[PDB]
mmCIF file of C-alpha atoms and ligand atoms in Angstrom:
data_model
loop_
_atom_site.group_PDB
_atom_site.id
_atom_site.type_symbol
_atom_site.label_atom_id
_atom_site.label_comp_id
_atom_site.label_asym_id
_atom_site.label_seq_id
_atom_site.Cartn_x
_atom_site.Cartn_y
_atom_site.Cartn_z
ATOM 1 C CA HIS A 9 -24.035 21.109 76.123
ATOM 2 C CA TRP A 10 -23.658 17.016 76.768
ATOM 3 C CA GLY A 11 -21.309 15.089 74.558
ATOM 4 C CA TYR A 12 -18.708 12.276 74.659
ATOM 5 C CA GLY A 13 -15.664 13.873 76.132
ATOM 6 C CA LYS A 14 -13.979 13.874 79.552
ATOM 7 C CA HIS A 15 -15.973 17.043 80.618
ATOM 8 C CA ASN A 16 -19.148 16.584 79.297
ATOM 9 C CA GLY A 17 -19.580 12.612 78.420
ATOM 10 C CA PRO A 18 -21.605 9.734 80.105
ATOM 11 C CA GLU A 19 -20.150 10.393 83.699
ATOM 12 C CA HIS A 20 -21.604 13.678 83.551
ATOM 13 C CA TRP A 21 -25.105 13.342 82.051
ATOM 14 C CA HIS A 22 -26.664 12.707 85.201
ATOM 15 C CA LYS A 23 -26.546 16.081 86.388
ATOM 16 C CA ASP A 24 -28.734 17.432 83.532
ATOM 17 C CA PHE A 25 -30.745 14.256 82.755
ATOM 18 C CA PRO A 26 -31.151 12.447 86.027
ATOM 19 C CA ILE A 27 -33.055 9.553 84.606
ATOM 20 C CA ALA A 28 -29.447 8.577 83.582
ATOM 21 C CA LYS A 29 -29.577 6.666 86.939
ATOM 22 C CA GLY A 30 -33.112 4.897 85.997
ATOM 23 C CA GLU A 31 -34.569 1.644 86.300
ATOM 24 C CA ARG A 32 -34.359 1.004 82.741
ATOM 25 C CA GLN A 33 -31.271 2.634 81.107
ATOM 26 C CA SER A 34 -29.575 1.392 77.938
ATOM 27 C CA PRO A 35 -27.139 0.078 76.401
ATOM 28 C CA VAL A 36 -26.338 -3.032 78.623
ATOM 29 C CA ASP A 37 -24.476 -5.968 78.532
ATOM 30 C CA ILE A 38 -26.200 -9.128 76.892
ATOM 31 C CA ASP A 39 -25.059 -11.974 79.095
ATOM 32 C CA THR A 40 -25.962 -14.806 76.417
ATOM 33 C CA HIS A 41 -25.912 -17.824 78.790
ATOM 34 C CA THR A 42 -28.760 -16.016 80.928
ATOM 35 C CA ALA A 43 -30.613 -14.680 78.104
ATOM 36 C CA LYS A 44 -33.789 -16.929 77.856
ATOM 37 C CA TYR A 45 -35.672 -18.252 74.575
ATOM 38 C CA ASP A 46 -38.968 -16.778 74.754
ATOM 39 C CA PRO A 47 -41.788 -18.557 72.885
ATOM 40 C CA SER A 48 -44.143 -15.794 73.105
ATOM 41 C CA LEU A 49 -42.145 -13.681 70.684
ATOM 42 C CA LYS A 50 -43.757 -13.475 67.128
ATOM 43 C CA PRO A 51 -42.035 -13.834 64.103
ATOM 44 C CA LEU A 52 -40.162 -10.411 63.401
ATOM 45 C CA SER A 53 -40.755 -8.408 60.388
ATOM 46 C CA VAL A 54 -38.522 -5.549 59.001
ATOM 47 C CA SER A 55 -40.339 -4.286 56.151
ATOM 48 C CA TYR A 56 -38.194 -1.510 54.329
ATOM 49 C CA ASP A 57 -39.047 -2.147 50.319
ATOM 50 C CA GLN A 58 -40.707 1.110 50.339
ATOM 51 C CA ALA A 59 -38.189 2.928 52.449
ATOM 52 C CA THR A 60 -37.663 6.950 51.506
ATOM 53 C CA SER A 61 -34.606 8.277 52.594
ATOM 54 C CA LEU A 62 -34.251 11.963 52.742
ATOM 55 C CA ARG A 63 -30.901 13.582 54.182
ATOM 56 C CA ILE A 64 -27.990 12.555 55.970
ATOM 57 C CA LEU A 65 -26.975 15.282 58.989
ATOM 58 C CA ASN A 66 -24.195 15.682 61.350
ATOM 59 C CA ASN A 67 -25.715 16.597 64.460
ATOM 60 C CA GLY A 68 -22.511 17.170 66.343
ATOM 61 C CA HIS A 69 -22.796 13.524 68.028
ATOM 62 C CA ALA A 70 -23.152 11.210 65.381
ATOM 63 C CA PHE A 71 -24.650 11.127 61.836
ATOM 64 C CA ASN A 72 -28.262 10.486 61.091
ATOM 65 C CA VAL A 73 -29.654 9.253 57.825
ATOM 66 C CA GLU A 74 -33.326 10.615 58.035
ATOM 67 C CA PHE A 75 -36.230 8.826 56.434
ATOM 68 C CA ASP A 76 -39.848 10.139 55.225
ATOM 69 C CA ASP A 77 -42.095 8.856 57.881
ATOM 70 C CA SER A 78 -45.366 10.758 57.127
ATOM 71 C CA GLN A 79 -46.958 7.448 56.185
ATOM 72 C CA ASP A 80 -46.204 3.758 56.637
ATOM 73 C CA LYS A 81 -43.415 2.983 54.355
ATOM 74 C CA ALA A 82 -40.302 1.363 56.081
ATOM 75 C CA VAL A 83 -41.794 -0.184 59.297
ATOM 76 C CA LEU A 84 -40.672 -2.784 61.742
ATOM 77 C CA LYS A 85 -43.571 -4.979 63.439
ATOM 78 C CA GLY A 86 -43.583 -8.615 65.066
ATOM 79 C CA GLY A 87 -41.212 -10.049 67.497
ATOM 80 C CA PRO A 88 -41.607 -8.101 71.175
ATOM 81 C CA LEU A 89 -43.790 -5.167 69.304
ATOM 82 C CA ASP A 90 -47.332 -4.669 69.814
ATOM 83 C CA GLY A 91 -48.224 -2.499 66.664
ATOM 84 C CA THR A 92 -46.335 -0.982 63.783
ATOM 85 C CA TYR A 93 -43.073 1.056 64.123
ATOM 86 C CA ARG A 94 -42.029 3.360 61.540
ATOM 87 C CA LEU A 95 -38.459 4.132 60.774
ATOM 88 C CA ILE A 96 -37.411 7.546 60.929
ATOM 89 C CA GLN A 97 -33.590 7.672 61.328
ATOM 90 C CA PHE A 98 -30.411 5.331 61.182
ATOM 91 C CA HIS A 99 -27.225 6.141 62.843
ATOM 92 C CA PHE A 100 -24.131 4.995 64.359
ATOM 93 C CA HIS A 101 -21.862 4.521 67.479
ATOM 94 C CA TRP A 102 -18.015 3.966 66.868
ATOM 95 C CA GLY A 103 -15.005 3.675 68.373
ATOM 96 C CA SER A 104 -11.195 5.370 67.863
ATOM 97 C CA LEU A 105 -9.954 1.981 67.312
ATOM 98 C CA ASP A 106 -11.399 -1.484 66.458
ATOM 99 C CA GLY A 107 -11.545 -2.720 69.881
ATOM 100 C CA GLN A 108 -14.318 -0.597 71.049
ATOM 101 C CA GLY A 109 -17.119 1.476 69.725
ATOM 102 C CA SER A 110 -20.510 -0.804 70.438
ATOM 103 C CA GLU A 111 -23.109 0.568 73.051
ATOM 104 C CA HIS A 112 -24.217 -3.037 73.838
ATOM 105 C CA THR A 113 -21.939 -5.806 74.681
ATOM 106 C CA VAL A 114 -22.338 -9.537 73.935
ATOM 107 C CA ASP A 115 -20.610 -11.443 77.170
ATOM 108 C CA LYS A 116 -18.646 -8.237 77.680
ATOM 109 C CA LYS A 117 -17.229 -8.393 74.214
ATOM 110 C CA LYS A 118 -17.088 -4.519 72.611
ATOM 111 C CA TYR A 119 -17.937 -4.484 68.629
ATOM 112 C CA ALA A 120 -15.928 -1.848 66.440
ATOM 113 C CA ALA A 121 -19.489 0.070 65.827
ATOM 114 C CA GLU A 122 -23.085 -0.481 66.473
ATOM 115 C CA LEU A 123 -25.806 0.489 63.701
ATOM 116 C CA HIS A 124 -29.406 1.799 65.231
ATOM 117 C CA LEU A 125 -32.587 1.871 63.225
ATOM 118 C CA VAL A 126 -34.859 4.083 65.146
ATOM 119 C CA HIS A 127 -38.586 3.366 64.625
ATOM 120 C CA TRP A 128 -41.887 5.161 66.471
ATOM 121 C CA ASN A 129 -44.926 3.324 67.612
ATOM 122 C CA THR A 130 -47.658 4.782 64.901
ATOM 123 C CA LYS A 131 -50.536 4.705 67.552
ATOM 124 C CA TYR A 132 -48.888 8.041 69.058
ATOM 125 C CA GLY A 133 -48.837 9.912 66.046
ATOM 126 C CA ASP A 134 -45.719 11.554 65.856
ATOM 127 C CA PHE A 135 -42.368 11.045 67.596
ATOM 128 C CA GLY A 136 -42.592 13.511 70.490
ATOM 129 C CA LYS A 137 -45.481 11.872 71.572
ATOM 130 C CA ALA A 138 -44.066 8.182 71.191
ATOM 131 C CA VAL A 139 -41.247 9.774 73.255
ATOM 132 C CA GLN A 140 -43.909 10.204 76.081
ATOM 133 C CA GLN A 141 -44.791 6.445 76.117
ATOM 134 C CA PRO A 142 -43.162 3.616 77.913
ATOM 135 C CA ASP A 143 -43.647 1.591 74.375
ATOM 136 C CA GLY A 144 -43.137 4.405 72.251
ATOM 137 C CA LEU A 145 -39.961 3.778 70.485
ATOM 138 C CA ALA A 146 -38.058 0.283 68.913
ATOM 139 C CA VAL A 147 -34.647 0.582 67.872
ATOM 140 C CA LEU A 148 -32.934 -2.517 65.922
ATOM 141 C CA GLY A 149 -29.357 -2.535 66.820
ATOM 142 C CA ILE A 150 -26.805 -4.189 64.634
ATOM 143 C CA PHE A 151 -22.982 -4.909 65.690
ATOM 144 C CA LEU A 152 -20.391 -4.087 63.109
ATOM 145 C CA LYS A 153 -16.919 -6.042 63.281
ATOM 146 C CA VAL A 154 -14.113 -5.309 60.946
ATOM 147 C CA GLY A 155 -13.418 -7.726 58.273
ATOM 148 C CA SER A 156 -14.954 -7.521 54.606
ATOM 149 C CA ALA A 157 -16.370 -4.526 53.223
ATOM 150 C CA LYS A 158 -20.360 -4.078 53.606
ATOM 151 C CA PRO A 159 -21.537 -2.970 49.936
ATOM 152 C CA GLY A 160 -24.534 -1.299 51.345
ATOM 153 C CA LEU A 161 -22.663 0.837 53.609
ATOM 154 C CA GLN A 162 -20.456 2.412 50.885
ATOM 155 C CA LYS A 163 -23.020 4.959 49.933
ATOM 156 C CA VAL A 164 -22.963 6.212 53.383
ATOM 157 C CA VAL A 165 -19.321 6.373 53.686
ATOM 158 C CA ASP A 166 -18.715 8.535 50.387
ATOM 159 C CA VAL A 167 -21.414 11.133 51.563
ATOM 160 C CA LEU A 168 -19.222 11.486 54.797
ATOM 161 C CA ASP A 169 -16.733 14.057 53.431
ATOM 162 C CA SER A 170 -19.532 16.385 52.495
ATOM 163 C CA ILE A 171 -20.955 16.488 55.993
ATOM 164 C CA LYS A 172 -17.646 16.788 57.877
ATOM 165 C CA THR A 173 -18.672 19.064 60.576
ATOM 166 C CA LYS A 174 -21.828 19.720 63.166
ATOM 167 C CA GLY A 175 -24.842 21.138 61.216
ATOM 168 C CA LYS A 176 -23.684 20.137 57.718
ATOM 169 C CA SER A 177 -26.253 18.076 55.759
ATOM 170 C CA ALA A 178 -26.638 16.595 52.508
ATOM 171 C CA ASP A 179 -29.112 14.968 50.213
ATOM 172 C CA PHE A 180 -29.228 11.135 50.864
ATOM 173 C CA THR A 181 -32.149 9.996 48.720
ATOM 174 C CA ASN A 182 -32.568 6.652 47.369
ATOM 175 C CA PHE A 183 -30.831 4.726 49.759
ATOM 176 C CA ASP A 184 -31.875 1.228 50.841
ATOM 177 C CA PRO A 185 -31.365 0.421 54.337
ATOM 178 C CA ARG A 186 -31.777 -3.230 53.619
ATOM 179 C CA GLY A 187 -28.181 -3.540 52.584
ATOM 180 C CA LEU A 188 -27.111 -2.792 55.986
ATOM 181 C CA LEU A 189 -28.673 -6.030 57.440
ATOM 182 C CA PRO A 190 -27.024 -9.494 58.225
ATOM 183 C CA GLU A 191 -28.708 -12.453 56.753
ATOM 184 C CA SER A 192 -30.158 -13.960 60.101
ATOM 185 C CA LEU A 193 -32.770 -11.990 62.065
ATOM 186 C CA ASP A 194 -31.827 -13.729 65.233
ATOM 187 C CA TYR A 195 -32.059 -11.193 68.161
ATOM 188 C CA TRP A 196 -32.076 -10.320 71.955
ATOM 189 C CA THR A 197 -34.520 -7.891 73.329
ATOM 190 C CA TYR A 198 -35.618 -6.136 76.248
ATOM 191 C CA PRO A 199 -36.980 -2.768 77.558
ATOM 192 C CA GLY A 200 -34.492 0.218 77.952
ATOM 193 C CA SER A 201 -34.050 3.906 77.159
ATOM 194 C CA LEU A 202 -32.114 6.422 74.345
ATOM 195 C CA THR A 203 -28.687 5.901 74.889
ATOM 196 C CA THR A 204 -27.880 9.676 74.940
ATOM 197 C CA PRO A 205 -29.745 12.339 76.514
ATOM 198 C CA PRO A 206 -32.496 13.100 77.146
ATOM 199 C CA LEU A 207 -32.053 9.116 77.936
ATOM 200 C CA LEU A 208 -35.954 8.420 77.978
ATOM 201 C CA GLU A 209 -37.171 5.234 79.141
ATOM 202 C CA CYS A 210 -39.454 4.523 75.892
ATOM 203 C CA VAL A 211 -37.455 2.038 73.871
ATOM 204 C CA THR A 212 -37.987 -1.609 73.007
ATOM 205 C CA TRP A 213 -34.540 -2.816 72.058
ATOM 206 C CA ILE A 214 -33.811 -5.373 69.329
ATOM 207 C CA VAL A 215 -30.132 -6.441 68.750
ATOM 208 C CA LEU A 216 -29.421 -8.688 66.179
ATOM 209 C CA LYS A 217 -27.130 -11.568 67.182
ATOM 210 C CA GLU A 218 -25.135 -11.651 63.765
ATOM 211 C CA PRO A 219 -22.910 -8.886 63.130
ATOM 212 C CA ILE A 220 -22.295 -7.133 59.721
ATOM 213 C CA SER A 221 -18.835 -7.121 58.713
ATOM 214 C CA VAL A 222 -17.414 -3.773 57.428
ATOM 215 C CA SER A 223 -14.041 -3.032 56.074
ATOM 216 C CA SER A 224 -11.229 -1.037 57.937
ATOM 217 C CA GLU A 225 -11.452 1.364 55.363
ATOM 218 C CA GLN A 226 -15.142 2.301 55.971
ATOM 219 C CA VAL A 227 -14.884 2.642 59.489
ATOM 220 C CA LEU A 228 -11.559 4.757 59.144
ATOM 221 C CA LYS A 229 -13.813 7.073 57.190
ATOM 222 C CA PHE A 230 -16.427 7.388 60.163
ATOM 223 C CA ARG A 231 -13.616 8.337 62.409
ATOM 224 C CA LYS A 232 -12.578 11.286 60.109
ATOM 225 C CA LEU A 233 -15.748 13.297 60.938
ATOM 226 C CA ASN A 234 -16.019 16.081 63.304
ATOM 227 C CA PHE A 235 -17.882 16.631 66.664
ATOM 228 C CA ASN A 236 -17.149 20.405 66.080
ATOM 229 C CA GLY A 237 -18.427 22.734 63.618
ATOM 230 C CA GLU A 238 -17.059 24.429 60.783
ATOM 231 C CA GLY A 239 -14.061 26.699 61.583
ATOM 232 C CA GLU A 240 -13.643 25.682 65.222
ATOM 233 C CA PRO A 241 -10.775 23.729 66.460
ATOM 234 C CA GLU A 242 -10.794 19.814 65.225
ATOM 235 C CA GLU A 243 -12.138 17.238 67.484
ATOM 236 C CA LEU A 244 -12.477 13.701 65.737
ATOM 237 C CA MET A 245 -15.998 12.252 65.979
ATOM 238 C CA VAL A 246 -14.940 9.006 67.508
ATOM 239 C CA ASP A 247 -15.956 7.133 70.784
ATOM 240 C CA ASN A 248 -19.568 8.251 70.515
ATOM 241 C CA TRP A 249 -20.834 5.434 72.486
ATOM 242 C CA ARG A 250 -22.454 5.343 76.123
ATOM 243 C CA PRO A 251 -20.896 2.180 78.226
ATOM 244 C CA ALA A 252 -22.956 -0.660 79.463
ATOM 245 C CA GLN A 253 -25.409 0.413 82.312
ATOM 246 C CA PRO A 254 -27.067 -1.510 85.333
ATOM 247 C CA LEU A 255 -29.628 -4.357 83.948
ATOM 248 C CA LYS A 256 -31.527 -3.782 87.405
ATOM 249 C CA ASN A 257 -35.184 -5.441 87.376
ATOM 250 C CA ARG A 258 -34.827 -6.623 83.497
ATOM 251 C CA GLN A 259 -34.416 -9.880 81.693
ATOM 252 C CA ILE A 260 -33.327 -10.161 78.077
ATOM 253 C CA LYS A 261 -35.083 -12.723 76.000
ATOM 254 C CA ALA A 262 -33.885 -14.264 73.171
ATOM 255 C CA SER A 263 -35.654 -15.101 69.695
ATOM 256 C CA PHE A 264 -33.951 -18.233 69.165
ATOM 257 C CA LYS A 265 -33.724 -21.615 70.881
HETATM 258 N N1 KBZ B 301 -20.285 23.610 80.834
HETATM 259 C C1 KBZ B 301 -20.718 22.376 80.744
HETATM 260 C C2 KBZ B 301 -21.720 21.015 80.900
HETATM 261 C C3 KBZ B 301 -21.114 19.937 81.368
HETATM 262 C C4 KBZ B 301 -21.777 18.955 81.336
HETATM 263 C C5 KBZ B 301 -22.944 18.968 80.983
HETATM 264 S S1 KBZ B 301 -24.072 17.358 80.623
HETATM 265 N N2 KBZ B 301 -24.610 17.413 82.132
HETATM 266 O O1 KBZ B 301 -25.335 17.910 79.873
HETATM 267 O O2 KBZ B 301 -23.333 16.518 80.487
HETATM 268 C C6 KBZ B 301 -23.721 20.108 80.421
HETATM 269 C C7 KBZ B 301 -22.940 21.158 80.296
HETATM 270 N N1 KBZ B 302 -33.928 11.635 69.820
HETATM 271 C C1 KBZ B 302 -33.390 10.744 69.878
HETATM 272 C C2 KBZ B 302 -32.713 9.251 69.988
HETATM 273 C C3 KBZ B 302 -32.825 8.294 68.987
HETATM 274 C C4 KBZ B 302 -32.371 7.338 69.378
HETATM 275 C C5 KBZ B 302 -31.040 7.064 70.292
HETATM 276 S S1 KBZ B 302 -30.448 5.649 70.290
HETATM 277 N N2 KBZ B 302 -29.081 5.918 70.104
HETATM 278 O O1 KBZ B 302 -30.849 5.205 71.660
HETATM 279 O O2 KBZ B 302 -30.856 4.681 69.059
HETATM 280 C C6 KBZ B 302 -30.804 8.350 70.829
HETATM 281 C C7 KBZ B 302 -31.625 9.494 70.848
HETATM 282 O O1 BGC B 303 -33.814 3.583 46.168
HETATM 283 C C1 BGC B 303 -33.544 2.952 47.366
HETATM 284 C C2 BGC B 303 -34.812 2.066 47.610
HETATM 285 O O2 BGC B 303 -36.103 2.887 47.743
HETATM 286 C C3 BGC B 303 -37.465 2.376 47.985
HETATM 287 O O3 BGC B 303 -38.454 3.138 48.284
HETATM 288 C C4 BGC B 303 -37.478 1.311 46.439
HETATM 289 O O4 BGC B 303 -39.049 0.735 46.607
HETATM 290 C C5 BGC B 303 -36.523 0.486 46.544
HETATM 291 O O5 BGC B 303 -36.624 -0.371 45.494
HETATM 292 C C6 BGC B 303 -35.122 0.893 46.497
HETATM 293 O O6 BGC B 303 -34.162 0.216 46.599
HETATM 294 O O1 BGC B 304 -41.892 -17.626 87.292
HETATM 295 C C1 BGC B 304 -41.433 -18.124 86.107
HETATM 296 C C2 BGC B 304 -41.184 -17.310 84.966
HETATM 297 O O2 BGC B 304 -40.315 -16.281 85.747
HETATM 298 C C3 BGC B 304 -39.743 -15.208 84.748
HETATM 299 O O3 BGC B 304 -38.770 -14.283 85.484
HETATM 300 C C4 BGC B 304 -39.277 -15.717 83.300
HETATM 301 O O4 BGC B 304 -39.333 -14.502 82.593
HETATM 302 C C5 BGC B 304 -40.498 -16.639 82.798
HETATM 303 O O5 BGC B 304 -39.753 -17.256 81.468
HETATM 304 C C6 BGC B 304 -40.693 -17.923 83.627
HETATM 305 O O6 BGC B 304 -41.553 -18.699 83.202
HETATM 306 O O1 GLC B 305 -28.547 6.685 48.123
HETATM 307 C C1 GLC B 305 -27.866 8.125 48.663
HETATM 308 C C2 GLC B 305 -27.141 8.486 47.813
HETATM 309 O O2 GLC B 305 -25.945 7.695 47.277
HETATM 310 C C3 GLC B 305 -25.068 8.319 46.487
HETATM 311 O O3 GLC B 305 -24.467 9.422 47.118
HETATM 312 C C4 GLC B 305 -25.883 8.933 45.290
HETATM 313 O O4 GLC B 305 -25.054 9.805 44.449
HETATM 314 C C5 GLC B 305 -26.859 9.928 45.582
HETATM 315 O O5 GLC B 305 -27.648 10.528 44.602
HETATM 316 C C6 GLC B 305 -27.738 9.190 46.989
HETATM 317 O O6 GLC B 305 -28.673 10.230 47.230
HETATM 318 ZN ZN1 ZN B 306 -27.938 5.143 68.843
#
């Protein structure tokens, strides 16, 4: 199956997922000089005060923190979005070393990691139906740089030893995703895709300009996870990022002048 290694990584995905060479693939490089302020963007609303986290899962590619999406609790609205988008999960992509790990790049610069908060458009009723629609998903992307520790991340870090291998999960109730945000909600936005197979072209990307800082110790613990299952030869879960894809017939819009 697909992965990130030399033999099943991003350069191979197109053989089973031909949309990998499609017209609005993600991630992309964000050229900050060509991005244009867009006055048509409405204020962005990240409304996570009633979020209900449930569980954390090592799925063999990353770890997902899953939320109750059975009703409107944690939602994302405004900005480029038409309607209400419910938070379903978040996960990260990261590197083997601090100089790489992000999926999006900013003027070609790679960050140490990238957080994706994944939301689906409630007009479509369920996630599976949303991923059959051009505007089915919205992903809020946040860059991580290494510096001071992020207190709102430490609970995540500290549970990772209990989900080291593929298929392991743990209870992860009462986690507040608001502690993962930076101060500013300035962002870039463009239409794109899932960055992992099945690579579906359903996503409105909203990428925050301000990174969060995490400590070296925090990201080092991400890198102790395993891609493999229990009992199998250890393959450290590192470099689980897709490189930037061609922009093609797209423009990146900025929320800020
Ligand atoms: N054996 C094998 C194998 C290699 C690559 C992939 S792909 N196209 O999903 O990256 C799948 C299976
Ligand atoms: N199913 C699914 C799925 C959800 C989000 C993403 S991402 N890396 O574009 O946020 C990838 C796959
Ligand atoms: O426990 C994590 C978070 O869960 C939410 O449902 C609560 O309303 C918040 O007050 C709390 O910070
Ligand atoms: O035709 C002019 C228009 O070109 C488009 O490509 C830009 O997105 C708009 O901002 C601009 O007003
Ligand atoms: O908030 C997420 C998790 O943080 C810590 O692991 C707590 O001990 C646990 O009870 C909680 O589920
Ligand atoms: Zn992702």
